[PDB]
């Protein structure tokens, strides 16, 4: 069970530093190099660097070498990317990935970095109630990205539509919908589960029929 576990969301102040981690498990940590890749909405994918935990050598994209430091701790099977002199330009999703023989075969889940002076704000979660019936929940007024939404703890997966967040007045708003057969609601309970990792908050909202 090869796994690269990151952390979903980091908020850091302009000018500060942040140290993101990539905990590897399921294989011999020192035998593969760990690479870091940046995904900024309108800039494709960018390779940041890699660290070879066996030799200790880190290679850097020279465009970011003055703001980037890569390290690895074999005793905890963890790779780290430290970014310094942060600007809004550094806000992005960052992935770690392992490689040795056939390219980047396993990837971390990604870590959303936001560089801002704004305070962390958990979302307000409101229910949206009215052959086929559409329900939803509105996840309003949170910062920073991201939030995750499931329905019935992941048991309700077909018929879901989660919409990308929109930023207004420095806060994000997202909506999620789920379409269900009428014969099951409100007999079988339906709950939207919202997670805001940056504030470490989880909310479960039952959609009452009223």
């Amino acid at each position: 069970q090869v796994q690269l576990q990151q952390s979903a969301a980091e908020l850091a102040r302009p000018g500060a530093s942040v140290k993101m981690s990539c905990k590897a498990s399921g294989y011999s940590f020192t035998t593969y190099t760990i690479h870091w890749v940046k995904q900024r909405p309108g800039q494709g994918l960018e390779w940041i660097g890699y660290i070879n935990p066996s030799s200790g050598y880190a290679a850097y994209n020279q465009n970011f070498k003055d703001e980037t430091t890569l390290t690895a701790d074999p005793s905890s099977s963890t790779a780290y990317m430290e970014l310094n002199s942060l600007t809004s330009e550094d806000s992005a999703v960052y992935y770690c990935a392992r490689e040795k023989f056939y390219g980047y075969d396993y990837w971390g889940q990604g870590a959303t970095l936001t560089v801002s002076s704004a305070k962390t704000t958990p979302p307000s979660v409101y229910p949206l109630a009215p052959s086929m019936v559409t329900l939803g929940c509105l996840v309003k007024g949170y910062f920073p990205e991201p939030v995750t939404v499931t329905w019935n703890s992941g048991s309700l997966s077909s018929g879901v539509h989660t919409f990308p967040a929109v930023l207004q007045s420095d806060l994000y708003t997202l909506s999620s919908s789920v379409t269900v057969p009428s014969s099951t609601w409100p007999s079988q309970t339906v709950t939207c589960n919202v997670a805001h990792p940056a504030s470490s908050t989880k909310v479960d909202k039952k959609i009452v029929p009223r």
Binding site: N61, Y102, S124, S158, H161, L174, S175
Partner: protein, 210 residues
């Protein structure tokens, strides 16, 4: 740096047809050891990148045999035979021969299916949000094709947005339009109207609420 130029930017394709994506490097990407470390990755919405092809032409384990890679020197091609709906997303080529490693700009593969009219639904502000002191009317326009669509919000007749990626199951698009206003302004109006104009039907799809 090695520039990776990917063609086309957008690749609409009908189900079962073939598709071809090209990648051209600004210089040869033959490593000193004789290998060409050209890889192909697929970024599906909401998922980490997925390795498809390594060393130009070698299919990664678990990748369906309908994906193939070819090319040499500076010109490389990803081929998808009998495209399936699960194939949609953004394809990237990647050269791992010369530091800094570089990705292509990405190609968004989109499924071309029959035109589909959206299912429109409108949702009033919940009780909880009203207690808070805001008012959001939410309009879902779900399961339509193609992506382009128009939405108009009208309060008492007078005039007053988030798009999903393409759905991997039925190749349709969905959109959410949220009208935000103060609770005081909400209390002093009666009819709220969400109109949906799409390529499918000549008449608009109107959903209102009192």
């Amino acid at each position: 740096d090695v520039l990776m130029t990917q063609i086309p930017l957008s690749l609409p394709v009908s189900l079962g047809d073939q598709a071809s994506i090209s990648c051209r490097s600004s210089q040869s990407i033959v490593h000193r050891n004789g290998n060409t470390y050209l890889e192909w990755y697929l970024l599906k919405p909401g998922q980490s990148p997925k390795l498809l092809i390594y060393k130009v032409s070698n299919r990664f384990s678990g990748v369906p045999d309908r994906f193939s890679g070819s090319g040499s020197g500076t010109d490389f091609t990803l081929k998808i035979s009998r495209v399936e709906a699960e194939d949609l997303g953004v394809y990237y080529c990647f050269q791992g021969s010369h530091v800094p490693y570089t990705f292509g700009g990405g190609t968004k593969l989109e499924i071309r299916r029959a035109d589909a009219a959206p299912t429109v639904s409108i949702f009033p502000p919940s009780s909880e949000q009203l207690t808070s002191g805001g008012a959001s009317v939410v309009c879902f326009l779900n399961n339509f094709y193609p992506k382009d669509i128009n939405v108009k919000w009208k309060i008492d007749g007078s005039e007053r947005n988030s798009w999903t990626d393409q759905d991997s199951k039925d190749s349709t698009y969905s959109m959410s339009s949220t009208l935000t206003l103060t609770k005081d302004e909400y209390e002093r109006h009666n009819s709220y109207t969400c109109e949906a104009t799409h390529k499918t039907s000549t008449s608009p799809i109107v959903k209102s609420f009192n």
